[PDB]
Amino acid sequence: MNPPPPETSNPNKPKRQTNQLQYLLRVVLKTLWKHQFAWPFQQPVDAVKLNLPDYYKIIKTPMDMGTIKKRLENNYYWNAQECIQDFNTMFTNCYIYNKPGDDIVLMAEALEKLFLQKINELPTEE
């Protein structure tokens, strides 16, 4: 079975709108989301449909861009670092679970390179 996905809203978790979080949705997430390599990362890993019975025995902090997108759209994050951490968790999980040099890793590596380039250009808080 798959676990429940990571939450994307929480009525008790404070929220605000900041220009850095606006940038993470409009520039960073959008650039990665539309990239030709985005698709394996656009939703939680479906260990059932993908026949990966050991995925959630190895990965206990799953994360994916579908979750990140919803968190941004739902004002789930208070700050940019929370979102950056989620992207990093996504990439790290990929590099832990998959064999080095596999295509999925090369795909993540290409997305991470773009990610780091866009994060280097994070605007200062207004």
Count of residues in contact with ligand 8M6, rule CB under 6 A:
11
The residue whose Cβ lies closest to ligand 8M6 is 40
Burial 63-79 (b: 16+ CB within 10 A, else e): bbbbbbbebbeeebbee
Site for ligand 8M6 in 63-102 (CB under 6 A): 94, 97-98
Q: What residue type is 64 in one-letter code? A: D
Residues 9-48: x where in contact with ligand 8M6 by CB under 6 A, - otherwise, as a string:
-------------------------------xx---x---
Q: Which is nearer to ligand 8M6, 24 or 45 (CB)?
A: 45
Amino acid, res. 11: P
Chain discontinuities in the chain, listed by preceding residue (C to N exceeding 2.5 Å): none
DSSP run (H or E) holding 88: helix 80-97
Binding site for ligand 8M6 (CB under 6 A): 40-41, 45, 50-52, 94, 97-98, 103-104
